[PDB]
Design an enzyme around this catalytic site. Structure first.
Site, PDB file in Angstrom:
ATOM      1  N   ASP A  13      43.345  39.719  33.376  1.00 46.91           N
ATOM      2  CA  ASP A  13      43.625  38.900  34.546  1.00 46.91           C
ATOM      3  C   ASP A  13      42.495  38.977  35.565  1.00 46.91           C
ATOM      4  O   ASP A  13      42.413  39.931  36.339  1.00 46.91           O
ATOM      5  CB  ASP A  13      44.926  39.384  35.184  1.00 46.91           C
ATOM      6  CG  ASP A  13      45.312  38.586  36.410  1.00 46.91           C
ATOM      7  OD1 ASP A  13      44.736  37.498  36.627  1.00 46.91           O
ATOM      8  OD2 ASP A  13      46.217  39.044  37.158  1.00 46.91           O
ATOM      9  N   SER A  64      33.844  24.236  43.310  1.00 46.92           N
ATOM     10  CA  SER A  64      33.559  23.127  42.425  1.00 46.92           C
ATOM     11  C   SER A  64      32.986  21.961  43.220  1.00 46.92           C
ATOM     12  O   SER A  64      33.316  21.762  44.383  1.00 46.92           O
ATOM     13  CB  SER A  64      34.841  22.723  41.685  1.00 46.92           C
ATOM     14  OG  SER A  64      34.692  21.521  40.955  1.00 46.92           O
TER      15      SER A  64
END
EC number: 3.4.23.22
Length: 330
Positions: A35, A199
């Site tokens: 994770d 992004s």
């Protein structure tokens, strides 16, 4: 040194991925959920409340000659999906894919929440976010990666998750045969303890690319792609009959649909998520309403590039002095 381990979807939907991890001496192999959005390595154990164990493999520290109780240490964690676990702490030898760390903090669960109990395939979590998020008290502990880093050939790990197929976590090297084209690197902020990046935009299907900054985290422990409501609405508007359902808890769509792809930007590069990756199947057995793999982050407080996004790429988690993230197509 290096390590390399195969990671395998837990079910036919890729709800999560498990990777075998050797703990203790002799080795006890547990299948852990790696994770990159958390920083605790915790396991089901011989100390876990018996009624809360249902099929998991447990770590038994008393059977490990290298286990030592970390005196006075406790831990307690709550995850974004509402699940939680807590317990005490041992140090022991932990190996992943041939890479060994001695003195790793292994957090032994005394209690786990129902969602962990109900998932027989996940024996615990191995956190790969920054150690500043580790919950051990009163002395915070380091992640497996942080402990291994100085010994690695290069201070990196990579995630190569499969769509409906096994994939690979590598430590200490970049497998240049595992991706196509070049790796585009992008800046990371560690201020919130995550692999947080921005992004450069998105496209839906064959549509034009929208240049827009989307801050979010690269999180292998989250199944879906969680993005701003505007972006998510633009995606689902291209699917006939798709709608946001408050009763179900997100966007659903007719199982008869053909889903468009979703592209996200990494600098000037583009990663394309095929439409099929966005299908999470019937909302309940036999239903013709299917659950979407792109959902709104509104009210999460952060955008999350979870497995839906990451499995479309070869992803480099670069733990150099100034960390960065790399993405390549594959």
């Amino acid at each position: 040194s290096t390590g390399s381990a195969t990671t395998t979807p837990i079910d036919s939907l890729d709800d999560a991925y498990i990777t075998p991890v050797q703990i203790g001496t002799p080795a006890q192999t547990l299948n852990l959920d790696f994770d990159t959005g958390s920083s605790d390595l915790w396991v089901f154990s011989s100390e876990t409340t018996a009624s809360e164990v249902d099929g998991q493999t447990i770590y038994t520290p008393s059977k490990s000659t290298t286990a030592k109780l970390l005196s006075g240490a406790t831990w307690s964690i709550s995850y974004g999906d509402g699940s939680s676990s807590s317990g005490d702490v041992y140090t022991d030898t932990v190996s992943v894919g041939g890479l060994t760390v001695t003195g790793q903090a292994v957090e032994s669960a005394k209690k786990v929440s129902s969602s962990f109990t109900e998932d027989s395939t996940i024996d615990g979590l191995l956190g790969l976010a920054f150690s500043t998020l580790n919950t051990v008290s009163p002395t915070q502990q380091k992640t497996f990666f942080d402990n291994a880093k100085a010994s690695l050939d290069s201070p990196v790990f990579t995630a190569d998750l499969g769509y409906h197929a096994p994939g690979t976590y590598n430590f200490g090297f970049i497998d240049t045969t595992a991706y196509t084209g070049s790796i585009t690197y992008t800046a990371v902020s560690t201020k919130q303890g995550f692999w947080e990046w921005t992004s450069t935009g998105y496209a839906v299907g064959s549509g034009t690319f929208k240049s827009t900054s989307i801050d979010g985290i690269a999180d292998t422990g989250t199944t879906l792609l969680y993005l701003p409501a505007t972006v998510v609405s633009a995606y689902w508007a291209q699917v006939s009959g798709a709608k946001s359902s408050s009763s179900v808890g997100g966007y659903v769509f007719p199982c008869s649909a053909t889903l468009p792809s979703f592209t996200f930007g990494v600098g000037s590069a583009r990663i394309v998520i095929p439409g099929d990756y966005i299908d999470f199947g019937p909302i309940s057995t036999g239903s013709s309403s299917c659950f979407g793999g792109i959902q709104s982050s509104a009210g999460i407080g952060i955008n999350i590039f979870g497995d839906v996004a990451l499995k479309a790429a070869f992803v480099v988690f670069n733990g150099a002095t100034t960390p960065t993230l790399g993405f390549a197509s594959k």
